[PDB]
Amino acid sequence: MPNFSGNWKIIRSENFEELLKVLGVNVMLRKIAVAAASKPAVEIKQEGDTFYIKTSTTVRTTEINFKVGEEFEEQTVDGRPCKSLVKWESENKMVCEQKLLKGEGPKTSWTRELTNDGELILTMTADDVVCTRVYVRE
Numbered sequence: 001m002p003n004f005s006g007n008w009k010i011i012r013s014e015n016f017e018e019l020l021k022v023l024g025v026n027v028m029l030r031k032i033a034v035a036a037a038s039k040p041a042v043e044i045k046q047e048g049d050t051f052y053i054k055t056s057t058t059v060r061t062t063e064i065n066f067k068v069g070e071e072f073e074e075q076t077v078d079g080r081p082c083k084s085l086v087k088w089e090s091e092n093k094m095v096c097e098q099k100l101l102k103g104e105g106p107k108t109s110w111t112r113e114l115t116n117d118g119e120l121i122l123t124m125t126a127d128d129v130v131c132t133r134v135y136v137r138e
């Protein structure tokens, strides 16, 4: 019965500021984002391979809708419009490759995985730098 669906509570965050730095976010905006990202609300709805994911903070909210295997548009973690495509790497792990709509920048991606223990891992990557965030349902 359990899947990616849930209201998810963060329990661990690593390397978020480093990710924003590689993306070229300046010091003062990074400080704002890091603080706000420390207590996000995350809502996922899954129906088969169709997903809704809303990630909210006091300073910024993202809401994405996608089907695995079908291109969609969203934003990079630093706010730049991109084309995205999610695939199943494995049964419990989706991987999203991103391409900017305009300009150039680090190669970005994200992954979401349901681990053996019932928890969710999000990773966000820019070039070689990875941010890892772990959640449990509320």
Ligand SMILES: CC(C)N1CCC(C)(C)c2cc(C#Cc3ccc(C(=O)O)cc3)ccc21
Pocket (backbone or CB within 6 Å): 010, 020, 025, 029, 030, 032, 033, 034, 036, 037, 040, 042, 055, 057, 059, 060, 077, 078, 079, 122, 133
């Ligand atoms: C200054 C501020 C408004 N600002 C401008 C710069 C920038 C776009 C980088 C930015 C990013 C965020 C974020 C985030 C976040 C990402 C993932 C999660 C998660 O999945 O848990 C939670 C939060 C917040 C503020 C913010």
